[PDB]
Symmetry: C2
Subunit: 88 residues, 2 copies
């Protein structure tokens, strides 16, 4: 009701540590991770975070928390989700 | 000096914190996350870890580290991978 499944997408440079620190920061959030897909390809990584929030302001707040990492250049919201029968 | 892309499959009960702690433990490893995919289905969640390891012993050790979690009941190795990693 007040809660909904919110989505985030993080694209940053694939360094020996960034992929670890990024999802680490995510795992220590206030909310519970129901889905997350990070893949480092070619030289960049895209970490798609899926968590439940009480409001949109909560979602925009997480963005700023992720933008604290200098290695990341894109922190964006996922309006259209990948959540349906058969996920891969 | 060997090093291969090792995959791991973790299935545990979707609890208030498990999904967070599980990937949080993963970030603590001596290896860089190349791909991580966590998703909950029906009261359960499956997290797939994709990382690099020098030796198969280094990989079996990661299992034992993940198997320390009471909320998890399956910790397996992903042999058949969709990771077409080549040069053109």
């Amino acid at each position: 009701m007040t809660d909904f499944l919110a989505g985030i997408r993080i694209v940053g440079e694939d360094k020996n540590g960034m992929t670890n620190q990024i999802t680490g920061v995510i795992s220590k959030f206030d909310t519970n991770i129901r889905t997350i897909v990070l893949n480092a390809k070619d030289g960049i990584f895209t970490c798609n975070l899926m968590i439940f929030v009480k409001n949109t302001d909560k979602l925009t707040t997480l963005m700023d928390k992720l933008r604290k990492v200098q290695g990341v250049f894109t922190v964006e919201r996922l309006s259209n989700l990948e959540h349906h029968h058969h996920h891969h």
